[PDB]
Amino acid sequence: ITGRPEWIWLALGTALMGLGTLYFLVKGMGVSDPDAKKFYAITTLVPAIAFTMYLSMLLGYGLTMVPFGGEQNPIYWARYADWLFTTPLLLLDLALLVDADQGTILALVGADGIMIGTGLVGALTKVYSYRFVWWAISTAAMLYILYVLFFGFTSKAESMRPEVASTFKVLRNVTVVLWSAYPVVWLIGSEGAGIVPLNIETLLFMVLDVSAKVGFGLILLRSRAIFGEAE
Amino acid sequence: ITGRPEWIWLALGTALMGLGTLYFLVKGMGVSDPDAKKFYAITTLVPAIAFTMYLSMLLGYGLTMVPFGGEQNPIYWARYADWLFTTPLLLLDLALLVDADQGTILALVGADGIMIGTGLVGALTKVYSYRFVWWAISTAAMLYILYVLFFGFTSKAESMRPEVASTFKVLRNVTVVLWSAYPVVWLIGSEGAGIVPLNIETLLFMVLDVSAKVGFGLILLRSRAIFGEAE
Amino acid sequence: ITGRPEWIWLALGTALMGLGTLYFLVKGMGVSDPDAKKFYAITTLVPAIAFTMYLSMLLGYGLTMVPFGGEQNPIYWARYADWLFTTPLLLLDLALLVDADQGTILALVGADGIMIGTGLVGALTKVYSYRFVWWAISTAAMLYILYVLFFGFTSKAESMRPEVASTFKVLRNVTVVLWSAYPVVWLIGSEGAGIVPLNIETLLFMVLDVSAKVGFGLILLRSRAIFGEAE
Ligand SMILES: CC(C)CCC[C@@H](C)CCC[C@@H](C)CCC[C@@H](C)CCOC[C@@H](CO)OCC[C@H](C)CCC[C@H](C)CCC[C@H](C)CCCC(C)C
Ligand SMILES: CC(C)CCC[C@@H](C)CCC[C@@H](C)CCC[C@@H](C)CCOC[C@@H](CO)OCC[C@H](C)CCC[C@H](C)CCC[C@H](C)CCCC(C)C
Ligand SMILES: CC(C)CCC[C@@H](C)CCC[C@@H](C)CCC[C@@H](C)CCOC[C@@H](CO)OCC[C@H](C)CCC[C@H](C)CCC[C@H](C)CCCC(C)C
């Protein structure tokens, strides 16, 4: 484990995702509202999945070597197995908050799968220049997601209860800022141009992951928007 | 790229799926009917997924070598990753058109997963004679799907609006004819008996894919069956 | 095939899953109740999936070698591909029986995915002591599932029709007893401590699989709880 300088950030990430999972699990014990139960189930699964994948990276299972640039490059593939399941769950939290229609939910989840799937292909591609073709396709899929979150959901939240509109607006802004950083870290990190070393890259993804999952969840599950209007 | 004679058909397929995706995306911009939005989302995702997998084959990522018959045989595995997601989406288009019940939808999607999954196992199997055992199981799963589309959905469409009944009947006939060709191309192509060479096999799958996805989508999204009855 | 002593139990399992699939398929022909169709579709898919994965193990495709303990250990990875899809389908049978809320269904299916996913990682892990870390995480996920089936569903079934309450109680008890045996067989078998040899381990999993899928299905599909109350 300790033979890799980035191990400290993988261990911290593992701990923070595990602690986040347990807090949400305990906090959700005393909840019977069927609407609130939906948000607790979605939001608790997110850091639980991330916990297992951070642990796999810490123990060395989620790491492979990819030859490109005449070098064997360490690629943590477990990140994409994490994101494949956690990013659509996070979008479902937002879509259920605004009572989005089914067709829009399917478009979001499908574009998200394309985003993560093409990012994985780009991470494992051995022809250096082709890695950035996949990065560009994946980034186009992300821009579609961000467009929908702004010019489809925002207008839908305003016609909703005030507390669900204000909570959505906050979580929307958090998501757009944090998610946009991921393609940048990829491009300048060891998967892309190799400007930033792997140990610093790992620290950046850990800060982003914890903020986008645990921080996101703390804002959502403390809001009254997750409960139905009741007397 | 150009070192493979089949590259021209992979490049054409990539272009036609990309163009198809963009047309459906633009055409769906001016749509607010929640029913129509469902069909546009399903139908636009189909060629978008196929685009990415054709590109992976063009660039050489979606290709592996499988030893059988005393030879290293080029097997494009990316086809099955495509079909795993696009064939159930196409069946969902048909099932939603006739307002199929949930139990029937689950049976269709499950049989479809078995069809594609066993076809993938057959494509990667190293014992030559066993490849055709998997082909037979996969073909049995397809025949179940075709039976349901005829002796379960057809009777349901007649009790529906006339425009949804006539549109379903057309898309049903297109699907049964085109899908039935796939097991035949597999059997006589490089995955099976090896009668037809890979470059011709690739041309045939490209014609079938574009027809079953883009051609299918053009018929559906030009129909009024996708809109609810409104004044 | 016959070069492996466990082949006899893989062949028996294949036959019993295939026969089970055909019986459920025939029995479900004469069913039009939309509620009953749901249970028949879920319950017939379970042994059909298991059939294909037992066949892959029989023919040698679903087997790999994992080095640990200074030895190349035969690991049947196809079991986890089976369980990944069949265990959530079995939980869906139970959840639909008691009309569970959506949030609870998602929590069950998500915990089940974590259970199977971490068990697969543990089966393929090359550092011997780490294999049991994954076993423990997977077992914690199972205990969560069992808790929900007892202290969330049981109370919900009592407020239901008497026949659905008594049928659920029976299937609940069958599930908790049979599922609990799996982590024990893993721990003492070739994936874990290696006390029980592989051929005996394979026999035990076959008895458990057939009972948990075909036996489970025979109890459910003979009950009147799967039909709506009708005159
Ligand atoms: C509606 C939305 C959900 C739609 C989703 C969008 C999606 C279509 C976007 C594209 C996804 C696609 C790129 C997934 C590729 C997975 C692949 C990286 C797995 C590893 O295989 C890659 C190479 C080794 O580098 O295999 C070496 C050769 C091996 C012999 C490969 C044989 C196994 C194949 C991988 C079998 C295909 C399985 C499916 C891809 C499983 C789904 C994985 C997940 C990442 C989507
Ligand atoms: C309700 C419906 C959706 C049900 C679906 C029906 C489905 C059950 C039908 C059978 C599907 C099954 C054959 C999928 C097999 C995937 C497999 C080809 C992936 C590549 O692995 C094959 C060998 C190399 O040749 O791995 C070499 C050895 C490696 C060490 C393998 C270890 C990884 C395992 C593959 C882990 C299992 C992952 C799941 C199979 C992922 C789903 C893939 C998709 C193709 C279903
Ligand atoms: C809501 C719920 C459904 C959530 C589900 C819970 C889930 C997150 C729990 C953890 C699942 C995770 C451990 C799955 C790992 C699959 C992995 C074993 C496949 C084989 O790859 C392992 C190594 C060889 O040993 O690959 C060698 C290196 C290769 C180069 C690997 C590159 C391919 C990657 C495997 C791509 C990721 C694909 C996804 C993991 C596909 C889903 C598989 C299924 C088992 C979940």
Ligand SMILES: *C/C=C(C)/C=C/C=C(C)/C=C/C1=C(C)CCCC1(C)C
């Ligand atoms: C909890 C994890 C989250 C919210 C991860 C989000 C990840 C992304 C938005 C990743 C995007 C990428 C691109 C847009 C292209 C480059 C490759 C990716 C996958 C890093």
Ligand SMILES: *C/C=C(C)/C=C/C=C(C)/C=C/C1=C(C)CCCC1(C)C
């Ligand atoms: C857009 C792609 C489509 C509609 C693909 C359809 C593919 C099939 C219907 C494939 C069927 C197969 C068999 C029936 C057995 C032989 C292997 C397959 C997977 C080619």
Ligand SMILES: *C/C=C(C)/C=C/C=C(C)/C=C/C1=C(C)CCCC1(C)C
């Ligand atoms: C039809 C198959 C069924 C119902 C299989 C159930 C399997 C389990 C409940 C497996 C549980 C495991 C653990 C709890 C940890 C050890 C590894 C597993 C996956 C065997």
Ligand SMILES: CCCCCCCCCCCCCCC
């Ligand atoms: C979206 C965030 C990207 C900003 C990356 C900042 C990295 C600064 C760290 C110093 C770079 C290390 C280079 C010298 C080793």
Ligand SMILES: CCCCCCCCCCCCCCC
């Ligand atoms: C009462 C609110 C705080 C509860 C404690 C939460 C502990 C989980 C770890 C959170 C750290 C990361 C927060 C986002 C920066």
Ligand SMILES: CCCCCCCCCCCCCCC
């Ligand atoms: C379902 C369509 C299958 C028909 C295949 C027709 C192939 C004819 C092309 C000529 C065969 C090439 C053999 C000589 C190289």
Ligand SMILES: CCCCCCCCCCCCCCC
């Ligand atoms: C107005 C209808 C035609 C629009 C142009 C569609 C261009 C997408 C490519 C379609 C070619 C394949 C059609 C099926 C044979």
Ligand SMILES: CCCCCCCCCCCCCCC
């Ligand atoms: C949950 C069931 C686990 C019980 C396992 C009993 C196995 C007894 C078979 C004899 C053990 C073989 C050891 C000598 C070869």
Ligand SMILES: CCCCCCCCCCCCCCC
């Ligand atoms: C009339 C009920 C029996 C029908 C025959 C079922 C045959 C399928 C194989 C069942 C054997 C396994 C039963 C569970 C132990």
Ligand SMILES: CCCCCCCCCCCCCC
């Ligand atoms: C194995 C991959 C299957 C999933 C394909 C994605 C489409 C799923 C459609 C689900 C239809 C709704 C069923 C109720």
Ligand SMILES: CCCCCCCCCCCCCC
């Ligand atoms: C990782 C594979 C999980 C999918 C298994 C297929 C069954 C899914 C059941 C979904 C139940 C409906 C939830 C609302």
Ligand SMILES: CCCCCCCCCCCCC
């Ligand atoms: C185009 C939709 C408007 C909202 C999206 C904001 C774009 C942020 C740019 C992200 C940069 C990634 C490289």
Ligand SMILES: CCCCCCCCCCCCC
């Ligand atoms: C048996 C259901 C009737 C409709 C299915 C038509 C069968 C077409 C044969 C396809 C040939 C594939 C080898």
Ligand SMILES: CCCCCCCCCCCCC
């Ligand atoms: C803790 C929830 C109560 C019901 C679960 C029964 C636990 C059975 C123990 C299984 C042993 C697996 C190692």
Ligand SMILES: CCCCCCCCCCC
């Ligand atoms: C080795 C660098 C080659 C540059 C390729 C950049 C491709 C980016 C595509 C974005 C449209």
Ligand SMILES: CCCCCCCCCCC
């Ligand atoms: C090398 C050819 C061996 C023939 C096997 C055919 C199997 C087909 C099974 C269809 C029932």
